Amino acid sequence: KLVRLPGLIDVHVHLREPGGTHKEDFASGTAAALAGGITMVCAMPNTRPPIIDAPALALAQKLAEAGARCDFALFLGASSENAGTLGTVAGSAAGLKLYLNETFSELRLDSVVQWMEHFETWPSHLPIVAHAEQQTVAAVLMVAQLTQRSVHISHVARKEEILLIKAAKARGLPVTCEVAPHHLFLSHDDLERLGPGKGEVRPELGSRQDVEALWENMAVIDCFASDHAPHTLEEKCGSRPPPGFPGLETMLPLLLTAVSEGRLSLDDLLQRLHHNPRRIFHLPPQEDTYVEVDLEHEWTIPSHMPFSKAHWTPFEGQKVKGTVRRVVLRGEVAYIDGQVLVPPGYGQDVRKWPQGAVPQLPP
Amino acid sequence: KLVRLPGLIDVHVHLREPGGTHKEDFASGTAAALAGGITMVCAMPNTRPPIIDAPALALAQKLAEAGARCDFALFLGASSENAGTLGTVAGSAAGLKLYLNETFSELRLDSVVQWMEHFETWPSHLPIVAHAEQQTVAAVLMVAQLTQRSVHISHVARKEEILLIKAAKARGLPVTCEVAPHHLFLSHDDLERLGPGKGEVRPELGSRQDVEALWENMAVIDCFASDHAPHTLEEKCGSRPPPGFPGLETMLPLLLTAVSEGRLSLDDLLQRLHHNPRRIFHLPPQEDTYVEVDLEHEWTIPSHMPFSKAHWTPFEGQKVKGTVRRVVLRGEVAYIDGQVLVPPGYGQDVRKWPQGAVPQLPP
Numbered sequence: 001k002l003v004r005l006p007g008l009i010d011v012h013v014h015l016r017e018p019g020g021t022h023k024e025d026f027a028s029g030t031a032a033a034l035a036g037g038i039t040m041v042c043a044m045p046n047t048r049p050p051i052i053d054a055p056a057l058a059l060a061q062k063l064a065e066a067g068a069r070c071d072f073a074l075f076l077g078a079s080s081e082n083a084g085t086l087g088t089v090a091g092s093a094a095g096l097k098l099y100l101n102e103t104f105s106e107l108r109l110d111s112v113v114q115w116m117e118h119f120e121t122w123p124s125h126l127p128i129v130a131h132a133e134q135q136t137v138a139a140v141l142m143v144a145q146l147t148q149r150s151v152h153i154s155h156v157a158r159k160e161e162i163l164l165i166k167a168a169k170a171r172g173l174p175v176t177c178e179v180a181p182h183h184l185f186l187s188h189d190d191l192e193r194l195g196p197g198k199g200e201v202r203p204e205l206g207s208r209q210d211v212e213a214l215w216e217n218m219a220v221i222d223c224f225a226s227d228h229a230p231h232t233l234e235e236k237c238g239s240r241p242p243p244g245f246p247g248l249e250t251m252l253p254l255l256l257t258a259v260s261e262g263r264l265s266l267d268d269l270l271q272r273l274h275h276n277p278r279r280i281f282h283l284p285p286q287e288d289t290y291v292e293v294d295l296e297h298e299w300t301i302p303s304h305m306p307f308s309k310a311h312w313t314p315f316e317g318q319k320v321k322g323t324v325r326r327v328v329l330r331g332e333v334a335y336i337d338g339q340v341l342v343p344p345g346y347g348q349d350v351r352k353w354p355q356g357a358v359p360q361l362p363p
Numbered sequence: 364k365l366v367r368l369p370g371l372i373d374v375h376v377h378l379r380e381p382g383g384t385h386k387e388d389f390a391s392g393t394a395a396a397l398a399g400g401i402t403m404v405c406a407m408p409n410t411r412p413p414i415i416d417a418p419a420l421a422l423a424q425k426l427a428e429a430g431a432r433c434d435f436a437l438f439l440g441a442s443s444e445n446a447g448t449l450g451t452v453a454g455s456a457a458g459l460k461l462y463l464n465e466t467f468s469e470l471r472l473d474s475v476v477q478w479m480e481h482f483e484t485w486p487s488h489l490p491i492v493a494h495a496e497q498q499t500v501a502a503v504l505m506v507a508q509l510t511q512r513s514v515h516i517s518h519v520a521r522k523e524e525i526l527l528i529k530a531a532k533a534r535g536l537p538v539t540c541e542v543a544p545h546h547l548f549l550s551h552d553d554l555e556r557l558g559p560g561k562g563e564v565r566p567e568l569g570s571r572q573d574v575e576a577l578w579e580n581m582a583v584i585d586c587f588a589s590d591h592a593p594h595t596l597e598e599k600c601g602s603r604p605p606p607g608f609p610g611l612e613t614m615l616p617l618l619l620t621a622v623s624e625g626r627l628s629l630d631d632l633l634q635r636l637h638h639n640p641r642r643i644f645h646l647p648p649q650e651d652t653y654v655e656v657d658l659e660h661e662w663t664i665p666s667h668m669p670f671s672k673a674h675w676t677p678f679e680g681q682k683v684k685g686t687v688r689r690v691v692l693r694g695e696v697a698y699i700d701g702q703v704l705v706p707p708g709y710g711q712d713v714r715k716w717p718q719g720a721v722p723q724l725p726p
């Protein structure tokens with residue numbers, strides 16, 4: 001007996017096109033999304049060129065419209081030069097992304113004054129997301145308060161961070177956050193198996209106590225998002241390994257396993273992979289769209305999942321219970337038991353749908 | 364014709380006793396203070412042992428009472444273990460010091476949650492000072508807001524930091540700050556002369572634009588404080604140079620030079636070295652205490668000033684106009700033209716004076 005879920009949304013993926021297409025492209029990354037029960041993705045801007053101006057966004061939109069198999073929205077990225085320049089295209093983007101710490105990314109900012117300038121100039125009704133680790137969470141929260149608006153914190157990975165956010169929420173501050181599956185299902189204890197290259201990710205894998213703190217504070221977690229960050233094995237195993245894990249194909253199976261163990265409920269999962277993503281990023285519904293999963297099927301994660309060009313996975317060898325059997329996207333069968341059945345280009349930019357524009361007061 | 368100033372206060376000095384007495388001790392450091400026209404100092408807790416518990420404070424109090432030539436208050440330092448343990452001795456200290464970045468200091472904290480715990484447990488009516496650089500300023504400001512209290516930011520050194528504080532003040536937030544003379548009178552341009560060892564200090568020397576931004580934003584600066592941080596030349600020139608400059612003997616002459624050039628007024632100076640220190644740290648007046656200075660005398664800073672055991676200075680070769688001629692402390696001549704005339708032990712702990720206790724609501 002299969003369980004029907006709504007179309008799930010991953011608000012944090014790296015699809016590497018343009019410029020890193022050996023790692024992933026729109027076609028392979030969205031195939032990976034569909035296989036993981038995800039029907040809508042928000043693609044991060046740290047591509048090559050990065051999506052930091054109108055011409056780069058225009059290019060990315062056409063690449064996505066031609067390559068994507070599921071629906072999508074594209075982030076703009078904040079740079080040291082583009083504050084106050086994105087107003088005409090801002091509403092066409094998923095939101096604005098700030099990279100506030102060292103990681104795989106034209107996009108580190110030099111000064112908190114630059115963060116302020118972005119918070120002041122980006123339209124107030126549109127989403128802002130920050131990569132903000134440890135004390136940087138507190139710092140960007142301060143900037144959000146000085147500028148009287150909200151912020152969404154990406155991949156929370158530490159007890160320190162989740163408790164800070166918890167304290168902010170208790171004070172009524174408008175902050176939301178997401179947690180990635182590797183920070184719920186991997187820890188320092190796995191670094192021996194993974195090794196130092198494969199194990200590179202930002203935020204880094206946490207201690208057992210970090211992992212336990214995220215589960216204990218599930219009520220504080222608004223969204224799950226994969227931070228699908230594909231790099232090839234050669235890259236992960238080489239002399240200067242980039243940080244990141246692929247995760248679209250493994251996220252839902254990992255979480256369904258946790259549901260079957262009673263670690264969270266099916267509703268808890270759907271709030272975090274469907275409802276809260278919709279409401280935080282003002283993402284539209286998808287007509288005639290759903291995912292059928294099998295919660296009984298036990299399997300072991302192989303050395304690589306079928307679709308991502310990353311062709312490796314840090315979850316290799318983990319036992320899971322839960323499978324994506326079928327995905328229907330806008331009335332077409334998109335995925336069945338390992339076969340993707342919609343072509344590159346089937347996917348659409350949800351920000352161009354009338355119901356996908358973010359409501360605003362007349363300016 | 365001499366100008367009579369009130370007894371000046373330096374809220375940020377490192378006197379190195381106990382445990383680093385080859386660099387400075389209470390007797391030599393307070394001689395340096397008097398020679399610089401300073402009659403009251405607040406001594407930082409990063410000694411050996413550090414002042415992080417009642418027994419260390421008790422030891423430091425006796426050392427200071429026996430060695431100090433001018434009046435003083437002693438900071439407590441925050442550690443990863445002492446939150447919620449300092450209540451009985453808190454009121455006897457200058458305030459609580461948090462070390463939030465890498466520097467010469469049992470006292471880095473591991474987590475912003477630890478900062479929160481200190482802000483929650485330290486008595487609300489008593490001062491808290493943070494060493495907080497760059498984004499850490501924003502982060503500690505967030506913690507202060509979550510806990511609904513004030514914070515004083517030590518040695519602001521960057522355009523980024525002063526503008527962040529300016530923005531916080533414009534929002535009515537209770538934050539004050541100080542700036543040290545090296546961040547007003549030295550910059551990157553001096554590193555060639557200083558070299559990489561002598562030039563080590565935290566916050567590091569800023570760009571010309573940082574220096575210009577501090578002067579332009581003088582209205583935002585509540586206090587000047589030396590961050591007198593003596594280390595010997597051998598240490599500064601050796602293979603692992605500690606950060607810090609000695610500065611008690613040079614601070615007032617540098618600032619008086621600026622006054623004579625019309626860069627700020629005598630009042631601007633006295634607000635920042637007397638009135639604002641008093642009001643932020645609840646420091647008592649000193650009866651029959653004053654400083655006589657000569658604003659006409661031109662001289663060149665030598666390779667070392669007479670008193671500090673540091674026996675070097677990064678201001679060597681700078682021309683100044685302005686001299687401390689005489690200091691009277693509580694009715695005794697304490698300093699005249701290079702001669703200190705009060706013995707070690709003349710100085711007193713101002714927190715033990717009835718007028719030096721911080722007022723509080725009945726608990």
Ligand SMILES: NC(=O)N[C@@H](CC(=O)O)C(=O)O
Pocket residue numbers: 014046103104105131200201202203227229230242243244245
């Ligand atoms: N998280 C990572 O380790 N890498 C991400 C960048 C990011 O999300 O910060 C990537 O794009 O490779």
Ligand SMILES: NC(=O)N[C@@H](CC(=O)O)C(=O)O
Pocket residue numbers: 377409466467468494563564565566590592593605606607608
């Ligand atoms: N500022 C420095 O470079 N050094 C200070 C420590 C401090 O004030 O942070 C010291 O005590 O040596």
Ligand SMILES: [Zn+2]
Pocket residue numbers: 103131154155202203
């Ligand atoms: Zn990130």
Ligand SMILES: [Zn+2]
Pocket residue numbers: 012013014044227229
């Ligand atoms: Zn990412």
Ligand SMILES: [Zn+2]
Pocket residue numbers: 466494517518565566
């Ligand atoms: Zn400091």
Ligand SMILES: [Zn+2]
Pocket residue numbers: 375376377407590592
């Ligand atoms: Zn200091």
